mmCIF file with all atom_site columns, C-alpha atoms in Angstrom:
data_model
loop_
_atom_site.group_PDB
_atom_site.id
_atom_site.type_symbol
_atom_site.label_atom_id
_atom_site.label_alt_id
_atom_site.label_comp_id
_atom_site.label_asym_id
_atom_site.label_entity_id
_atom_site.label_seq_id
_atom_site.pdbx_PDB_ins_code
_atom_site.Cartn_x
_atom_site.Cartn_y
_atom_site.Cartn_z
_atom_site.occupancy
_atom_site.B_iso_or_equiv
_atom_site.pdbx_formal_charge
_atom_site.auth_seq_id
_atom_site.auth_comp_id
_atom_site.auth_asym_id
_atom_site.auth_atom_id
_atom_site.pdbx_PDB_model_num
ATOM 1   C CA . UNK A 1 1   ? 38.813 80.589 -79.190 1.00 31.92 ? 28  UNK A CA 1
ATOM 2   C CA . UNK A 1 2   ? 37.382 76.608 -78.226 1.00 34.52 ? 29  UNK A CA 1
ATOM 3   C CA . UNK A 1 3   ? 36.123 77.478 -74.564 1.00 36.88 ? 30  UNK A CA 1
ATOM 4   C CA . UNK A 1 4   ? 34.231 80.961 -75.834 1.00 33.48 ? 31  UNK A CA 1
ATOM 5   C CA . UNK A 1 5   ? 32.910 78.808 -78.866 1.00 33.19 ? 32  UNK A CA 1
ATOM 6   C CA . UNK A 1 6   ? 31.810 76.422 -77.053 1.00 33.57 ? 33  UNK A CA 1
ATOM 7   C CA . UNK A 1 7   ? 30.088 78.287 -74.518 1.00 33.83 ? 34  UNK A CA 1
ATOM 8   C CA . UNK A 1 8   ? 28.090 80.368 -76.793 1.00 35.09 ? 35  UNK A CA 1
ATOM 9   C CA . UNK A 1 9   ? 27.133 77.232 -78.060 1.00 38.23 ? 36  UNK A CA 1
ATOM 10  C CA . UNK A 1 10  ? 25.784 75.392 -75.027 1.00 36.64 ? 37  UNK A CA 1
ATOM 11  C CA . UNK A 1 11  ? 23.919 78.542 -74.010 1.00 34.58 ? 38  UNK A CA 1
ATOM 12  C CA . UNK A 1 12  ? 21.849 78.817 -77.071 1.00 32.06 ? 39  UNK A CA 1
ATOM 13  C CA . UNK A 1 13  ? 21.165 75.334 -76.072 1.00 33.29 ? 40  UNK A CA 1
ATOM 14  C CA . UNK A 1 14  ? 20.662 75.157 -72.677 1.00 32.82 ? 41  UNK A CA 1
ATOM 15  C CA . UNK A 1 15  ? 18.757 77.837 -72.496 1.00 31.99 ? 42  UNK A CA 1
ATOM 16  C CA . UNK A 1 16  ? 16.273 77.949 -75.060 1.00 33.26 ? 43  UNK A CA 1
ATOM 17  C CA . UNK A 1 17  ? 14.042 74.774 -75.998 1.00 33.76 ? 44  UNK A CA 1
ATOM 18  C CA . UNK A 1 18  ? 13.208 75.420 -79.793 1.00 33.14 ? 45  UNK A CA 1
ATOM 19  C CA . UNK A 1 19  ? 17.106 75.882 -80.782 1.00 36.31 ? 46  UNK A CA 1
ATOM 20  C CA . UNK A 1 20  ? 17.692 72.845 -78.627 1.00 34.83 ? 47  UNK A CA 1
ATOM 21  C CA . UNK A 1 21  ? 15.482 71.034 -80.070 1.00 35.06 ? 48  UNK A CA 1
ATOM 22  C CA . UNK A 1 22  ? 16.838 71.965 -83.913 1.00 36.69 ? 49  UNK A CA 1
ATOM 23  C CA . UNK A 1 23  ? 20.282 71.020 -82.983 1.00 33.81 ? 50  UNK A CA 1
ATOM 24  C CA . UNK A 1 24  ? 19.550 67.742 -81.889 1.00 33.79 ? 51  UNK A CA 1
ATOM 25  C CA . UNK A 1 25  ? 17.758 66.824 -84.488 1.00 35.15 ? 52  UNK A CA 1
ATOM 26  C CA . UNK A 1 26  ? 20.145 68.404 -87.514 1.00 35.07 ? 53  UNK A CA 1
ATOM 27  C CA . UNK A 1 27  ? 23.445 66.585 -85.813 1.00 34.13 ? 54  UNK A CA 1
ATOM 28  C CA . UNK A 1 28  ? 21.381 63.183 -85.150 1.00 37.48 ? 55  UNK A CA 1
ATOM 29  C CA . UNK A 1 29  ? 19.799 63.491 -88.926 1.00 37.85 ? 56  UNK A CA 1
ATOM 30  C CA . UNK A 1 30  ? 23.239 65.492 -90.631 1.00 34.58 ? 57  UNK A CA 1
ATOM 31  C CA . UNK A 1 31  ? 21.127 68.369 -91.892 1.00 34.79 ? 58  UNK A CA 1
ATOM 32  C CA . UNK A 1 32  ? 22.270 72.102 -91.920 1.00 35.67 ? 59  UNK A CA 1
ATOM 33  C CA . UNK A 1 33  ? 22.791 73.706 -88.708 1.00 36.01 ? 60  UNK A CA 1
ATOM 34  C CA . UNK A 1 34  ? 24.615 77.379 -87.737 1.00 37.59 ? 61  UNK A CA 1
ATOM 35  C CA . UNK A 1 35  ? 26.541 75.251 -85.361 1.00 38.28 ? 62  UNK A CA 1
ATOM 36  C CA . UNK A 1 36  ? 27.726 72.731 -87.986 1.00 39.33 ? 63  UNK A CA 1
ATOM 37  C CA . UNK A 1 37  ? 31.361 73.807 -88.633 1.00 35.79 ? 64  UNK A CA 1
ATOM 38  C CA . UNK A 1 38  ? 31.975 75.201 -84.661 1.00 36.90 ? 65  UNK A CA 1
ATOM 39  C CA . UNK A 1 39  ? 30.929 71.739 -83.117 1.00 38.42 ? 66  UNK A CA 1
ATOM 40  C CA . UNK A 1 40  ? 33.481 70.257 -86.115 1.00 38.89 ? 67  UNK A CA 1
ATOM 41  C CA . UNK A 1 41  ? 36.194 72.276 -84.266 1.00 40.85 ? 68  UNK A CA 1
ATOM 42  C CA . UNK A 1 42  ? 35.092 71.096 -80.527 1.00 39.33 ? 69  UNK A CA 1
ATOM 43  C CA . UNK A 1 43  ? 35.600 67.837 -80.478 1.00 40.10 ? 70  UNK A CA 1
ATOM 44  C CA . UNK A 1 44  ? 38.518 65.568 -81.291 1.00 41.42 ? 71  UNK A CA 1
ATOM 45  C CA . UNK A 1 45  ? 38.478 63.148 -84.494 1.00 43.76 ? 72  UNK A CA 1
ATOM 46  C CA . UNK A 1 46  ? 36.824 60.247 -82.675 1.00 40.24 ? 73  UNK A CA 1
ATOM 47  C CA . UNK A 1 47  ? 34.749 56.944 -83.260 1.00 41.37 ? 74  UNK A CA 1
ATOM 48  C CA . UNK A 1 48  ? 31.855 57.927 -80.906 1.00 42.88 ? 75  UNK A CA 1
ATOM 49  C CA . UNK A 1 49  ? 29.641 59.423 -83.032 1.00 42.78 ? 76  UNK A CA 1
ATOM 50  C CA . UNK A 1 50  ? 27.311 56.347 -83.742 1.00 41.13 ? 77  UNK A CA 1
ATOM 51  C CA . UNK A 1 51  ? 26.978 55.790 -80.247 1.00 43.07 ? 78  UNK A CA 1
ATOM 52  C CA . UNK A 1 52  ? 26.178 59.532 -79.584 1.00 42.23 ? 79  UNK A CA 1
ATOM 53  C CA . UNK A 1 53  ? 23.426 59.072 -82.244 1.00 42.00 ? 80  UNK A CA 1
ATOM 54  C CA . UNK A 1 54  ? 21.741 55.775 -80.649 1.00 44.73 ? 81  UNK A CA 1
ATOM 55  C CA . UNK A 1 55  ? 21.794 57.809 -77.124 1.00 44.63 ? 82  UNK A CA 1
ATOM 56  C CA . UNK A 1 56  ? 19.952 60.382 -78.782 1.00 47.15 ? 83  UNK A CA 1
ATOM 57  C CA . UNK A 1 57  ? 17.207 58.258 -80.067 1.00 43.26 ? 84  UNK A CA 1
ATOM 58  C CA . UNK A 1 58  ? 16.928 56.159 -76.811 1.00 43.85 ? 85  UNK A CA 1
ATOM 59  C CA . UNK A 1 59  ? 16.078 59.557 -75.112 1.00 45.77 ? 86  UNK A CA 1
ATOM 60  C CA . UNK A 1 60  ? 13.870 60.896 -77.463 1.00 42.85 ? 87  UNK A CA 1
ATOM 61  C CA . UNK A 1 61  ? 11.758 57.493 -77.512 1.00 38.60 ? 88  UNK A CA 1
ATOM 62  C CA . UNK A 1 62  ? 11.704 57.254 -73.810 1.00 38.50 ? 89  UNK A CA 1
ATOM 63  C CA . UNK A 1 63  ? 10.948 61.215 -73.509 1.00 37.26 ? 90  UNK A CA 1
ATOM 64  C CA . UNK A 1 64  ? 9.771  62.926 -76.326 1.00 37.64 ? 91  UNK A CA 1
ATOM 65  C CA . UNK A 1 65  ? 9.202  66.389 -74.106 1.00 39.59 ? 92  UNK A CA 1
ATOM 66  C CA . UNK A 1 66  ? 12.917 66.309 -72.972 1.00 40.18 ? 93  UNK A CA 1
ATOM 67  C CA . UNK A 1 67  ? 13.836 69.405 -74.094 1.00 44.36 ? 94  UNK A CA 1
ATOM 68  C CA . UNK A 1 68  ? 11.515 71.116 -71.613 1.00 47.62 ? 95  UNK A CA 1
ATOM 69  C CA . UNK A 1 69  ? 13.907 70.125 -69.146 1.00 45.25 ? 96  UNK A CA 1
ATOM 70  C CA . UNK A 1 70  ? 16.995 72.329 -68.659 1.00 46.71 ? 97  UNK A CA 1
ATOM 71  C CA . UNK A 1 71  ? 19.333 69.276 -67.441 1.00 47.26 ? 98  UNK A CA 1
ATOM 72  C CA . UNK A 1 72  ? 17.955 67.244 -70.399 1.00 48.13 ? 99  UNK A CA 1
ATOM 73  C CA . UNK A 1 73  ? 18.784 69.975 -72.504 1.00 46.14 ? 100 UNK A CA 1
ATOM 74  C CA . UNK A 1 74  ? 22.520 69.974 -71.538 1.00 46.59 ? 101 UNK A CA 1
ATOM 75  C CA . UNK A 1 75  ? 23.019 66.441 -71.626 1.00 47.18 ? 102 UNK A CA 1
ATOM 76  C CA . UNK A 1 76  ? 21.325 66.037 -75.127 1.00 45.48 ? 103 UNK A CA 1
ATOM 77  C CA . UNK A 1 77  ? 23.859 68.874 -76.212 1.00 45.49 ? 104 UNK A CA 1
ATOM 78  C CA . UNK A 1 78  ? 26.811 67.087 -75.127 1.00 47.08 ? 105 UNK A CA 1
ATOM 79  C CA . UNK A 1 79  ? 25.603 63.982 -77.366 1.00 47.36 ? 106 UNK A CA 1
ATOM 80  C CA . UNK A 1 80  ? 24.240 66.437 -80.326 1.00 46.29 ? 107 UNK A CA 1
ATOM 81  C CA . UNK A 1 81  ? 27.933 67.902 -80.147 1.00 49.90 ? 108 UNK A CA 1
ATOM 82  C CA . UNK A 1 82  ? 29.585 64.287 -80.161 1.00 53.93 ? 109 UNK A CA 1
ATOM 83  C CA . UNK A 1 83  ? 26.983 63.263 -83.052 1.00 53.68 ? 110 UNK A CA 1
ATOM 84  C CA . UNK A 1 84  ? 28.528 65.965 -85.501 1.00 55.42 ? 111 UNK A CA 1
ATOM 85  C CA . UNK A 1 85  ? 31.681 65.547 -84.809 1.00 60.18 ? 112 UNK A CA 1
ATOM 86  C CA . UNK A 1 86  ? 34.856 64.634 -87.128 1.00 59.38 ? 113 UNK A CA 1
ATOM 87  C CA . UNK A 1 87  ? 34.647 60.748 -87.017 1.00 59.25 ? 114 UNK A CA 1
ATOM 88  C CA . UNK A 1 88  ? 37.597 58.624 -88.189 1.00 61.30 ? 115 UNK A CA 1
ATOM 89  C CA . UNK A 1 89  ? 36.664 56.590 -91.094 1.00 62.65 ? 116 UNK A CA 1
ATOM 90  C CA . UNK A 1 90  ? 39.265 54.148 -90.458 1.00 63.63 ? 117 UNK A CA 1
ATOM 91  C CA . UNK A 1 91  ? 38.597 52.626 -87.288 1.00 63.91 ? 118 UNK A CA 1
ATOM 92  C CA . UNK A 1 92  ? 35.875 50.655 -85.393 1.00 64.18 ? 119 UNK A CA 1
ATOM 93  C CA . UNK A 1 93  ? 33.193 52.310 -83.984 1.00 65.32 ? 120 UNK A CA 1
ATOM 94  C CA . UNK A 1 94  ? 33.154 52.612 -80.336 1.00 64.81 ? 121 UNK A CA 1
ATOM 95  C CA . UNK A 1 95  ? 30.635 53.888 -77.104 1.00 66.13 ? 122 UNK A CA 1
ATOM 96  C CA . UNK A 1 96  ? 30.544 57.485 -76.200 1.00 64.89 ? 123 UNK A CA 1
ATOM 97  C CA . UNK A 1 97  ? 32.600 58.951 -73.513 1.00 69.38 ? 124 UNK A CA 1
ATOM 98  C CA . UNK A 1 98  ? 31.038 60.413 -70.677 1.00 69.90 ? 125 UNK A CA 1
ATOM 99  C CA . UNK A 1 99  ? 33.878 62.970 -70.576 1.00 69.92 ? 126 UNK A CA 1
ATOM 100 C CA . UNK A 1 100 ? 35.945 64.582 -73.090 1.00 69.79 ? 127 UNK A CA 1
ATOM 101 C CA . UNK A 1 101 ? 38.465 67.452 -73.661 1.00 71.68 ? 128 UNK A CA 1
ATOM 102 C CA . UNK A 1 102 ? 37.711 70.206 -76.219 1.00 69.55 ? 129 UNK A CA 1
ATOM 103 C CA . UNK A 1 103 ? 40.085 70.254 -79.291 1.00 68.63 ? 130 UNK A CA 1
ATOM 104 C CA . UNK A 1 104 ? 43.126 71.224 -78.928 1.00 68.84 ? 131 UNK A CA 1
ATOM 105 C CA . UNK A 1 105 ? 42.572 72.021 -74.961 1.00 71.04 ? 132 UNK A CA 1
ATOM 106 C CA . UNK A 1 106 ? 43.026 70.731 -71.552 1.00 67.34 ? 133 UNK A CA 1
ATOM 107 C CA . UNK A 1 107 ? 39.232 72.013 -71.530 1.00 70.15 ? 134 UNK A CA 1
ATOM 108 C CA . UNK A 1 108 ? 36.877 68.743 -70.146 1.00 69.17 ? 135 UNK A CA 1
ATOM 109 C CA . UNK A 1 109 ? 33.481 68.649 -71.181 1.00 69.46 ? 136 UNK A CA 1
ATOM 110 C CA . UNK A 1 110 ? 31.054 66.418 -69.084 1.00 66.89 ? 137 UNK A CA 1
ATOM 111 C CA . UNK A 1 111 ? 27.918 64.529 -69.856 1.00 68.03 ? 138 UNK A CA 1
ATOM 112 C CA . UNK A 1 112 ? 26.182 64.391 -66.234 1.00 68.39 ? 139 UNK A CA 1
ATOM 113 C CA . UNK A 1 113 ? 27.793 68.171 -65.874 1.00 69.66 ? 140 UNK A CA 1
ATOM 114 C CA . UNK A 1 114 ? 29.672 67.374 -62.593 1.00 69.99 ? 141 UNK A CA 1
ATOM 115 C CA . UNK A 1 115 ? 33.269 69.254 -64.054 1.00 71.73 ? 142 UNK A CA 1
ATOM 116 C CA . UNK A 1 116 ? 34.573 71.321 -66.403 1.00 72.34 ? 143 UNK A CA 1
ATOM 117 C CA . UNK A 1 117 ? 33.006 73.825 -69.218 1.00 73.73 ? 144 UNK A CA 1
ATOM 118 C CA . UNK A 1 118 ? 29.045 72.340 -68.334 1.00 75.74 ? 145 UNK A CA 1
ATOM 119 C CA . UNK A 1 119 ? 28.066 71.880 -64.239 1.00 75.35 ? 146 UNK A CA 1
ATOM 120 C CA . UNK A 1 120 ? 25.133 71.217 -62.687 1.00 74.63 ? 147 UNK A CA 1
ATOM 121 C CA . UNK A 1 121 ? 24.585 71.697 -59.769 1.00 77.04 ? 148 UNK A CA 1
ATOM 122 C CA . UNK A 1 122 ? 21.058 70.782 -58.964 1.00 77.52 ? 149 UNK A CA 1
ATOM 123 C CA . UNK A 1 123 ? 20.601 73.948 -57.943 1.00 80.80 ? 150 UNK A CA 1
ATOM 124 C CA . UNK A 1 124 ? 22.407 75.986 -60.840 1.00 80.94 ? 151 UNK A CA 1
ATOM 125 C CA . UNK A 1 125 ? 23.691 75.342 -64.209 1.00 83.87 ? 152 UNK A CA 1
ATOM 126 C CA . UNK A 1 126 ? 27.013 76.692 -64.911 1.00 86.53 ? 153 UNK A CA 1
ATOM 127 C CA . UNK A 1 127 ? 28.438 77.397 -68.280 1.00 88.08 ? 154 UNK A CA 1
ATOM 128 C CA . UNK A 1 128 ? 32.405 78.507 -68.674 1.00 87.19 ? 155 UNK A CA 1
ATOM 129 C CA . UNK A 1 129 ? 32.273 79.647 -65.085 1.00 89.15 ? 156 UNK A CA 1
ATOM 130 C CA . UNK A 1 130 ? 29.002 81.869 -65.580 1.00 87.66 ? 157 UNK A CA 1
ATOM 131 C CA . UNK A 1 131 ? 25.677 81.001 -63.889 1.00 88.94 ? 158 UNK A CA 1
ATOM 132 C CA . UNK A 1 132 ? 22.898 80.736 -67.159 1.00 86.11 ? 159 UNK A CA 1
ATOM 133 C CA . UNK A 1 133 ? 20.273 79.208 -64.839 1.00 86.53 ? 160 UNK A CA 1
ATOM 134 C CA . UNK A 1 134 ? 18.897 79.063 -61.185 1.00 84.32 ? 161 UNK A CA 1
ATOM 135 C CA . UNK A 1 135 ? 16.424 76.952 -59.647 1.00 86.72 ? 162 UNK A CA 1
#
């Protein structure tokens, strides 16, 4: 099931630093990672994955600590998922979404977490309708 695979993903991440940090760094690098095949699945066959990968770096250049930060967390997830996704070899490469739906579903998936399967509210943070943090 996409939306139960990809919440058990984004919890993992969200909340807990040291897996956060190893995902982002095995999608932005292409090394092994338990998540390798599922985030394969998520996302649609795109050309956004070089884009995804030069977010990444911008963010951890301009904050190396960002995965202290829940919210950080999420957002580096969406562009970690992006980064190790199914790219099509064919076409031009082009900028990251901000949005996107999940394989195969009318599921949307959203970088600054205002809809869908990841939303932040600056007082919670939502994932697949169930409350994983609280400030």
């Amino acid at each position: 099931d996409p939306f139960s695979r990809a919440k058990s993903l984004l919890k993992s991440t969200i909340l807990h630093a040291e897996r956060c940090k190893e995902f982002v760094g095995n999608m932005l690098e292409e090394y092994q990672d338990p998540a390798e095949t599922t985030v394969q699945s998520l996302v649609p066959i795109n050309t956004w994955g070089k884009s995804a990968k030069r977010k990444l770096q911008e963010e951890i250049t301009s904050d190396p600590d960002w995965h202290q930060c829940p919210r950080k967390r999420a957002k580096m997830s969406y562009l970690a998922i992006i980064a190790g996704s199914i790219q099509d070899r064919d076409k031009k490469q082009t900028n990251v979404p901000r949005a996107f739906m999940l394989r195969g579903s009318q599921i949307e998936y959203d970088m600054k977490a205002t809809r869908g399967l990841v939303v932040d509210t600056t007082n919670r943070i939502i994932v697949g309708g169930e409350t994983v943090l609280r400030e």
